[PDB]
Amino acid sequence: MQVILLDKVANLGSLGDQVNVKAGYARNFLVPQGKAVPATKKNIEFFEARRAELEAKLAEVLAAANARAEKINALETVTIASKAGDEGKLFGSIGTRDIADAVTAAGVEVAKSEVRLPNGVLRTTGEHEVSFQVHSEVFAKVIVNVVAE
Amino acid sequence: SRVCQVTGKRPVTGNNRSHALNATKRRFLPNLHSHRFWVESEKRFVTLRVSAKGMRVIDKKGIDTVLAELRARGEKY
Amino acid sequence: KRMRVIREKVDATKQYDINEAIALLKELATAKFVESVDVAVNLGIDARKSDQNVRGATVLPHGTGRSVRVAVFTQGANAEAAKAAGAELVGMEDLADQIKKGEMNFDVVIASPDAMRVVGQLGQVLGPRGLMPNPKVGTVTPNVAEAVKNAKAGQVRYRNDKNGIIHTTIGKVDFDADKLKENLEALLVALKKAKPTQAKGVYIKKVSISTTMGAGVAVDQAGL
Amino acid sequence: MATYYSNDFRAGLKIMLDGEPYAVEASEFVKPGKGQAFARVKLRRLLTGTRVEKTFKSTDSAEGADVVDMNLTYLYNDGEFWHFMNNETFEQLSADAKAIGDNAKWLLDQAECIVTLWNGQPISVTPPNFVELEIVDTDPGLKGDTAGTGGKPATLSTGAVVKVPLFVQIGEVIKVDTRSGEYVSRVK
């Protein structure tokens, strides 16, 4: 399925490109999330001759805003007080939703689907390391401590 | 019924034909599949029971065109 | 080393037809002495299947005459009628004792169904392992042996079995008429595909090369 | 491949049922009062050599097969194959490992052994009942304290092992019965 890109994607190419992609991949993931548009001649001209400047401005402004948000969530410390048993070992596993709304309480305005924590659950008390996928090319780190309430 | 909401592919009847030409009735069924399509014009997800041929027709003709054609035909989606 | 004109003129990429490099066969040679011409032939053969055996003799005309060493077994007046065919040892089980002695001169062994009795158990491990048995599909044990021996010693080039898929027979001396050798080489299909084993594989005659002793390398087409 | 009907074939026929040669050994035909006739044949699978039991229907029937046996004479072995020959046609022939199973140790050279060939091809060879063989290895028998017969293990020039009485030493030809794998006499 010939498709025109509206953004830099993983292993296809930069924007403003003509790539042959599988129909399923184009239909289910790319085109719903704006990352591509089918290579109809109308869209080819509409994009190349008319949009390939404005949408580029928007893309770079967004990349800059996301690097800004990465700079802004550089407080690098956020407190979490949840219920835990003895020997640490939280009874209730704190989660991505909890981390997100806690940092929004004390920090940046960030969505719940944004945080990307590697260890998976955060079942115990203590200092933990969580990553933040704010933009497809830039990440962020926060030190999250879980104090037993 | 098993009818592709885009084309209109119905179950057609035919024959089973053996090696000795013994004919028995049978049906051919259209490869129907429930699928949610992303209508960018409406920022919405619409669910049509399409065949695979209908999926390809939508790929080629754009979803909003097919939806307008359905509204013209008088078929609630 | 003077064995490198061959490697100059080895064309493995450009395969030739029958007419192209036939005249160059001795122009590709640097031999001290004189030799013959060999052939390259193949056919799908279940290494496993034994019902794939074809023994006999192939009469290839227009060439070398009595240059073969034969051992014969006859009973009766044919013991003297066979000496009229220029045969070497037309005799009795004394020839079997010669084989026991470990004789390497005689190569093709012939009999007659009356005296075949003598032949089979005699040199029994020896002759057949020597790839020289005496089946009847080939007529190496006849009743009218006068009418066949003059041919078997005159002009016959025998087909052989090999453990490998290889089946490469022999043509005659290098110095014969090259065009006529082409016809002689062509006169082999009518028999090499006269009797298959009915379990032939993908193709019939995959290889076709004409090497004389070690000199010529003429790869050819299966059809032409 | 004349088709054969159940109430027709007695023992000896070589039926070809189900892509497989057989050999009717015994058959009992029954015609009861008020019912379809049948035959209880004592078949014989002719490739693995096991006896199968089949009740055949008057109507149910099978094609014949070219399974035949005559007296071939062993010649030589080479690699995985055994070659034999006729004394009335002198037709050459080659078998395989499957055909010579456990008769490898019984055939020497020139033995006249009946072979079953099918599709013009051997499937089973039967070694002559008694074969004269020579012993490759034995422990010099010493009576020692033996009070009974004792016996002694002895390999042969073809690999086989037989119990030989006590005196047979090395280089003595013995006679064994292929059927029982046992010593019969020391052939002088």
Place this chain on the structure above:
RNA sequence: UUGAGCUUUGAUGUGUAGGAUAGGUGGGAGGGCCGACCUUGAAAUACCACCCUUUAAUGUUUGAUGUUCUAACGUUGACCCGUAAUCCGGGUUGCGGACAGUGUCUGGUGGGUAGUUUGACUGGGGCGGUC
């Protein structure tokens, strides 16, 4: 992560007996030294030919599962709404996840079901025999 093939550069087969440090099969006197001759087996030896047996560099044609992921799809998990509703739909969320399942084609099994066949003569018919 690898397995089989194909142009392909090459190497490589170790017993008995022959000195052994013989791949097979024909044609078998070629290139400082072998060869044949001779010892020899079951086959006897330089010379290259047709290839088998592995082995290593590319284009190879590729499949094979084995991990991860989410977005298709499933959800007879939980909650919210239509709503005075253990249906249905929509929305958050969790779990599976390109498996499952369905369509066309195809191999197998299939008395579960269906349509049918199962001869004639005959001193009644059957069995026996016969055509």
